[PDB]
Amino acid sequence: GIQGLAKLIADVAPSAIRENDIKSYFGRKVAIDASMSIYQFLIAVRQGGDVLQNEEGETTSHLMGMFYRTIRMMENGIKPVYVFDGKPPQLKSGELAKASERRAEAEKQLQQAQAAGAEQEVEKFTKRLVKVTKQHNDECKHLLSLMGIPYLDAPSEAEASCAALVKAGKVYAAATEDMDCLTFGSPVLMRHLTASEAKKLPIQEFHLSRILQELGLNQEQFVDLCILLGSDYCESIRGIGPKRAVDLIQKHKSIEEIVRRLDPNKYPVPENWLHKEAHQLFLEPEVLDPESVELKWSEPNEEELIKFMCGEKQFSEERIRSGVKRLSKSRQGSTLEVLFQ
DNA sequence: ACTCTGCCTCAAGACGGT
DNA sequence: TAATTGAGGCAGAGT
DNA sequence: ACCGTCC
Ligand SMILES: [K+]
Ligand SMILES: [Sm+3]
Ligand SMILES: [Sm+3]
Ligand SMILES: [Sm+3]
Ligand SMILES: [Sm+3]
Ligand SMILES: [Sm+3]
Structure with missing residues (x-):
């Protein structure tokens, strides 16, 4: 986070x-x-x-x-x-x-x-x-x-x-x-x-x-803000919290510029700071292709769910059957069946 | 006064009968 | 063969 | 809504 x-x-x-x-x-x-x-x-x-x-x-x-x-x-x-x-x-x-x-x-x-x-x-x-x-x-x-x-x-x-x-x-x-x-x-x-x-x-x-x-801010400036706040991917600056981080981004826009204008003795940056690499990861992360798989919500397989959740995992057959019925009826009310043309 | 750090704790689900 | 997160609360120190 | 129980 x-x-x-x-x-x-x-x-x-x-x-x-x-x-x-x-x-x-x-x-x-x-x-x-x-x-x-x-x-x-x-x-x-x-x-x-x-x-x-x-x-x-x-x-x-x-x-x-x-x-x-x-x-x-x-x-x-x-x-x-x-x-x-x-x-x-x-x-x-x-x-x-x-x-x-x-x-x-x-x-x-x-x-x-x-x-x-x-x-x-x-x-x-x-x-x-x-x-x-x-x-x-x-x-x-x-x-x-x-x-x-x-x-x-x-x-x-x-x-x-x-x-x-x-x-x-x-x-x-x-x-x-x-x-x-x-x-x-x-x-x-x-x-x-x-x-x-x-x-x-x-x-x-x-x-x-x-x-x-x-x-x-724009997106790249918002990413740098999140880096200064603290991300999983690199170090933040000691003594720069959410209040000073906003003022610095709003004023200098980029971390590269923040370093040039910060007093190295007052706010020294981390050693071998990877803020550039984390910047690249947030803006251009490795993601799936949204156009590859078409998201479908399909009819549940009741009998196999009973065998799996009840026969094997020992859930109440009464509760599981009831759950599948609810799931099947609610899908029928929110989902259109497939059409061919 | 305002801000930041370093500690500390605390919670983080859902069903069905009442 | 998995590596949260978040939200507050508090004292103490830096700005 | 509470609360024992879920598996
Ligand atoms: K920090
Ligand atoms: Sm994450
Ligand atoms: Sm994380
Ligand atoms: Sm078994
Ligand atoms: Sm087994
Ligand atoms: Sm993740």
Whole structure:
């Protein structure tokens, strides 16, 4: 993500944040960062500090949420396409190594609480070690196929390919919490689109054109702003936060110019700073071709979903059948069958 | 006064009967 | 064979 | 809407 960008928008560019009722999105298509939704379910969907699972010990929390949340979206006429990450870019390797440190230390502190018969400490580092695996992604892809819900494999970061689907008009918005989707150029970003019966947070749209207008920037200047704020791909400047970062971009436009005019003794830049390379990655990321695959929402295969979710993963047959019926009727009401001419 | 850093914590789902 | 993110809150120090 | 339960 971008450190503090959502807060900056809310304070400087509030006009870019628009809220609408779930009832207004009937018929709209959205792109979803699948990995983040899977992670949300593995973290939250716990029963007694442990995850849901079948008797074979195979985890099912990700299948639980993917199934029901996706159905709820379709009942509201919202048609999602799930986008899965691919090979991370090299620039992320500098940050990937720093993540393993946190997992290594979280593992060290895990067995410590275990050998110490702790209770709340076990549930503390356990959730901190959660991670989305290839088997998590493959099982969700398998589920979506049976549900008739489309998905796409991005060549690199899913966030970037979601944005490219919006640019191309193949979906209305990227439904995510990772604000760096705007840094990748997404015209629209939607938060809090869960279609949950609770309705605790309002559906927010972030319109990039509004952000650029109220900040007085173009896209390249907005990317440099996000770099100074803090991105996954390179270092920021120590002592330059969201307040000074805005004033500098608005005044000097480019980081290259900010360095020329900054006092090297007062605000020294990082050593071997890759702000140019991250700039190139945000503006011209490796993305799928939106014109290659035509997004279709298809009839779900009920009998295979029962065999998979119930026979194998041990979901309630009554609940799964009911879910597939809802999914099939809601698709019939929001989706036109294919026509030939 | 304003701003930034480095700490700290906390939460992160959904169904169906009541 | 995976590497969130986000939001606040607080004290303390730099501008 | 609350809350035990989901697997
Ligand atoms: K910084
Ligand atoms: Sm990201
Ligand atoms: Sm099995
Ligand atoms: Sm990602
Ligand atoms: Sm990241
Ligand atoms: Sm089995």
